[PDB]
């Protein structure tokens, strides 16, 4: 009943392939024929690109093309172009007569260095507490592509009640940003020795922590 | 060319019902099946229900059965989402996408080919609330202001009357477990200029005339 699994994030140059995977188990993608795939552009309705595996509807360029073994389905994407760059969603049909769609991939079509976030992570402020209250705030920012993960640490448990993290926007300077919050009450926060934000960019992984001092 | 126009999304609080149309044109819309799908923002696709062309049997997702609705008037080529037992995890734009295959009975050959630009559903129990902002305090800084329970949305961040612009970014709004809205705004500045130089972020919430002016200081 969880989305089809999807790499969170794949990027290419122009000019060169990429392939997203598409996996699911033989209640969906491994016994049927009827998997589908979506591109979405920020803020845009999501359009149709490939239906039943392998067809392609008019209109769509056939440097898209997909493909399915087990129960992997394949989106394979050749001559990348800066329009490329999207969200891509797999879909398939299920034996519960649904559509199970995918958890979805980034699409970077890359025009810039990689680059990996700068944190910044802010404790509660004075004034916060004085209202009953406690948010720590993990600032991400300068980052290429823009996809991260975000896990947050008290102390050295992981922890991940009272989190809301944004996805990832364009800055001014035309990297990324994304913000992620802990709310927990005062004495949450004035117990344990440290809490700890923790980013993974491609790879990658960056930590900081705070200290009620 | 395919059509689809969804509406009626809104506000509505945890428990109550509310109902969302989508208007079709440019095909024969007897002829197929319709689905609902959803989106929590800045998150992944989620199909929510299918009705197929003609009477037979619905389906729908796990997480929306025995609350959710789907049906049709062909006679006016509408498609309907009958939302019940809201849940705050069902805030969402959803989007009502045609079926492909021409006389389908299930979800199945073919995909879903065309999509309505969506609509916004907010499952609240909360009414208009003005942000309380408190400073994030600071060779470059990193400071700002956090923008906390609000609602609805938007607020608007500047920074020193509009003044200061560079290195500046608004992030979006959170919706949080507790119904209500929390965004952050953030200035990168200099090291040098901490001591000397005045940051004060503006925060206009138009639902409620409120502005808040807060200066953000080190330590």
């Known amino acids: 009943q969880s989305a089809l699994t999807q790499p969170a994030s794949v990027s290419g140059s122009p000019g060169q392939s990429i392939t997203i995977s598409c996996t699911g188990t033989?209640?969906?993608?491994?016994?049927?024929?009827?998997v589908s795939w979506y591109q979405q552009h920020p803020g845009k309705a999501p359009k149709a690109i490939i239906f039943?595996?392998?067809n392609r509807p008019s209109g769509i360029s056939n440097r898209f093309s997909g493909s399915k073994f087990g129960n992997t389905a394949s989106l394979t994407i050749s001559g990348l172009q800066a329009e490329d760059e999207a969200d891509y969603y797999c879909?398939?049909?299920?034996?519960?007569?649904?559509?199970?769609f995918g958890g979805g991939t980034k699409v970077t079509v890359l025009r810039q260095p990689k680059a990996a976030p700068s944190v910044t992570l802010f404790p509660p402020s004075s004034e916060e507490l004085q209202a009953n209250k406690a948010t720590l705030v993990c600032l991400i920012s300068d980052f290429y592509p823009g996809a991260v993960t975000v896990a947050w640490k008290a102390d050295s448990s992981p922890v991940k009640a009272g989190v809301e993290t944004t996805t990832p926007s364009k800055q001014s300077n035309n990297k990324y940003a994304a913000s992620s919050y802990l709310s927990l009450t005062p004495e949450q926060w004035k117990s344990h020795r440290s809490y700890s934000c923790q980013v993974t960019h491609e790879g990658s992984t960056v930590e900081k922590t705070v200290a009620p001092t | 060319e395919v059509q689809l126009v969804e509406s009626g999304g809104g506000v509505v609080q945890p428990g109550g019902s509310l109902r969302l149309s989508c208007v079709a044109s440019?095909?024969?819309?007897?002829?197929?099946?319709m689905n609902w799908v959803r989106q929590a923002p800045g998150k992944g696709l989620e199909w929510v229900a299918f009705?197929?062309?003609?009477?037979?049997?619905?389906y729908y997702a796990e997480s929306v059965r025995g609350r959710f609705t789907i049906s049709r008037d062909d006679s006016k080529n509408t498609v309907f989402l009958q939302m019940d037992s809201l849940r705050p995890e069902d805030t969402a734009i959803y989007y009502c996408?045609?079926?492909?295959?021409?006389?389908?009975?299930?979800?199945?050959?073919?995909?879903?080919?065309?999509w309505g630009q969506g609509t916004l559903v907010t499952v609240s129990s909360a009414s208009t609330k003005g942000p309380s902002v408190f400073p994030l305090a600071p060779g470059t800084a990193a400071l700002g202001c956090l923008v906390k329970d609000y609602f609805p949305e938007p607020v608007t961040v500047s920074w020193n009357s509009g003044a200061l612009t560079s290195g500046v970014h608004t992030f979006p709004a959170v919706l949080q477990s507790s119904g209500l809205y929390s965004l952050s705004s953030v200035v990168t500045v200099p090291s040098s200029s901490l001591g000397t130089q005045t940051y004060i972020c503006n925060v206009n919430h138009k639902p409620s005339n409120t502005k808040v002016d807060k200066k953000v200081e080190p330590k």
């Open positions: 996408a045609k079926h492909r295959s021409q006389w389908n009975f299930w979800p199945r050959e073919g995909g879903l080919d065309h």
């Open positions: 440019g095909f024969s819309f007897s002829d197929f099946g």
């Open positions: 009705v197929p062309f003609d009477r037979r049997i619905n």
């Open positions: 033989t209640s969906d993608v491994g016994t049927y024929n009827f």
């Open positions: 039943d595996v392998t």
């Open positions: 879909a398939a049909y299920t034996v519960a007569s649904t559509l199970l």
